[PDB]
C-alpha cells in the first residue's frame, strides 16, 4: 500500500508517495527533498513535524512524551504513513 504524503515545508507544499513500510523522511529524501535530521533513530527532535491531516505510525519513536504526541508532533525519521496525510515540517523549535 502506498500513501500520498503532502509535506508543508517553509518553501510550500510538496506531495510524495510513501510505501506503508517506508519512513517519511526516507521517502522524502528519495524524492529529492532535504529535510532536517540528526539521529535518524527517534532519539532527538531535530526531525520534528506536526500532523495537519491523516495518520502515521511512530511506534519506533522514543523522544516525545504523550502530551507532545497528543498535540500532533511527530518524528518524521521513524514515522510510517498509515493513511494519506499532511505534515508540517521543521517544527522542532516549537517544542522548546
Amino acid at each position: 500500500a502506498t500513501y500520498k504524503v503532502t509535506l508543508v515545508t517553509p518553501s510550500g507544499k510538496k506531495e510524495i508517495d510513501c510505501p506503508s513500510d517506508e519512513y517519511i523522511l526516507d521517502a522524502a529524501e528519495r524524492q529529492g527533498l532535504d529535510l532536517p535530521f540528526s539521529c535518524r533513530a527517534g532519539a532527538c527532535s531535530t526531525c520534528a513535524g506536526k500532523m495537519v491531516s491523516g495518520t502515521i505510525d511512530q511506534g519506533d519513536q522514543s523522544f516525545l512524551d504523550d502530551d507532545q504526541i497528543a498535540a500532533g508532533y511527530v518524528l518524521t525519521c521513524v514515522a510510517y504513513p498509515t493513511s494519506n496525510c499532511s505534515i508540517e515540517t521543521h517544527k522542532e523549535d516549537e517544542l522548546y
Binding site: 500500500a1 510505501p19 506503508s20 513500510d21 517506508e22 519512513y23 526516507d26 540528526s38 539521529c39 533513530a41 532519539a43 532527538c44 505510525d57 511506534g59 519506533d60 522514543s62 523522544f63 521513524v78 510510517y80 498509515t82
Partner: protein, 315 residues
C-alpha cells in the same frame, strides 16, 4: 597489557580528551571502546560548531583526530565492550571479553546512545537469551539460531561476531541495507545471514529456560512471522545514559545520569564520570571534551598525590 593507572570506559570526545590529558601526565592509560562508530559524535554526519575546527567536518573524522591525539601521547586504545565492574576495592576491576583490566582510577565515559528496553519480552528475557554484547555471549550460541535487531555500525559489527558461532543470523532492519551504501555488503554475503529488511521485532517469547522465538512484522501489514531463535541481540539507538553495566554501584541523579561533584568524581572514590553519561542538557562535543579534561586533571592530582591541580600548558 591489563594493569593501568587509568582505565577509561568509552572512546567518544569525553574519553579521548580525558586520555589525552592523563597520557600527557605519564599516567598509563587505556581506552576500552565498544565500537568507535557507535558514539554520538561518531554518528554526526557534519559538525560545524566545534570551536577550533572550521569548515566541513564529519563527526567521525573529528573523533578520529582526538583518538589519534590520545594515542600519540601514549594511550592504549582497545576495542573492548565493558560488561561489568568491581568497585569494592581501591584498584577498580573492569570486566571485558578481551580480559579484566585494572585501574587505580576509573572513568565512565559511555555517553547517552542507550535505549530503554522497548520490545515485549526484551526486559523479561534479559540474561536468558536477550543480550547486548556479542563478544560476551556469542560463544554460547554455537550452532544456534540468533536474531540481531538494528541498522547501525554496532549492529553490523556484532552480527559479524555472531556469524562465527550461530547456525543462522537473522538480521532485522527497518530500512534496506542498501541504505548504508555497501557498508553491509560483506555481512550480507555471509551464508549464515538471513535479512529481514523493513521489518520490526514486535515480541520476544520463550519458556523459563529462556528465549525460543520472536514475532516479526512488516510495518503496515496485518500478518506476522514467528522465527525460532535462542539469542536476541538488540542494538537500537536512543537518548539515554549508558549505565546498566555499572549495575547501580554509583549514585544516579533522578534524571538517570551519573551524579558527579565539581571535579567530575562519582559517589565512589577513584571513579569519575564525564560527558553525556551524566545526562546534563548540555549535550555538545566540546562540553563532553571539557568534562574529560577536568576529570583527567583531578585524576592526575589524586594518582600523583600532588598538593594542587597541575596545569598542562606550553606543550
Amino acid at each position: 597489557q591489563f594493569d593501568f593507572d587509568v582505565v577509561i570506559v568509552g572512546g567518544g570526545p569525553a574519553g579521548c580528551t580525558c586520555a589525552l590529558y592523563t597520557a600527557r601526565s605519564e599516567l598509563k592509560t587505556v581506552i576500552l571502546d565498544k565500537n568507535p562508530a557507535a558514539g554520538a559524535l561518531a554518528i554526526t554526519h557534519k559538525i560545524a560548531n566545534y570551536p577550533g575546527v572550521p569548515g566541513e567536518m564529519s563527526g567521525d573524522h573529528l573523533l578520529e583526530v582526538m583518538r589519534d591525539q590520545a594515542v600519540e601521547f601514549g594511550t592504549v586504545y582497545r576495542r573492548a565492550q565493558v560488561y561489568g565492574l568491581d568497585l569494592s576495592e581501591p584498584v577498580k576491576k573492569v570486566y571485558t571479553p578481551e580480559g579484566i583490566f585494572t585501574g587505580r582510577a576509573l572513568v565512565l565515559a559511555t555517553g547517552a546512545m542507550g535505549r530503554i528496553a522497548s520490545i515485549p519480552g526484551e526486559a523479561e528475557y534479559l540474561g536468558r537469551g536477550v543480550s547486548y554484547c556479542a563478544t560476551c555471549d556469542g560463544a554460547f550460541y554455537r550452532n544456534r539460531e540468533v536474531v540481531v535487531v538494528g541498522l547501525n555500525p554496532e549492529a553490523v559489527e556484532e552480527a559479524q561476531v555472531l556469524t562465527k558461532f550461530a547456525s543462522t543470523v537473522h538480521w532485522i532492519t527497518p530500512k534496506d541495507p542498501h541504505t548504508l551504501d555497501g557498508h553491509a555488503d560483506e555481512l550480507l554475503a555471509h551464508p549464515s545471514v538471513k535479512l529481514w529488511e523493513k521489518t520490526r521485532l514486535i515480541r520476544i517469547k520463550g519458556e523459563e529456560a529462556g528465549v525460543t522465538a520472536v514475532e516479526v512484522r512488516h510495518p503496515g501489514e496485518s500478518d506476522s512471522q514467528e522465527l525460532l531463535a535462542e539469542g536476541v541481540f538488540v542494538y537500537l539507538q536512543g537518548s539515554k545514559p549508558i549505565t546498566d553495566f555499572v549495575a547501580g554501584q554509583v549514585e544516579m541523579k533522578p534524571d538517570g545520569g551519573v551524579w558527579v561533584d565539581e571535579m567530575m568524581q562519582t559517589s565512589v572514590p577513584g571513579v569519575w564520570g564525564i560527558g553525556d553519561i551524566r545526562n546534563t542538557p548540555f549535550k555538545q562535543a566540546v562540553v563532553a571534551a571539557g568534562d574529560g579534561c577536568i576529570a583527567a586533571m583531578a585524576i592526575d592530582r589524586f594518582l600523583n598525590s600532588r598538593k594542587a591541580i597541575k596545569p598542562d600548558w606550553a606543550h
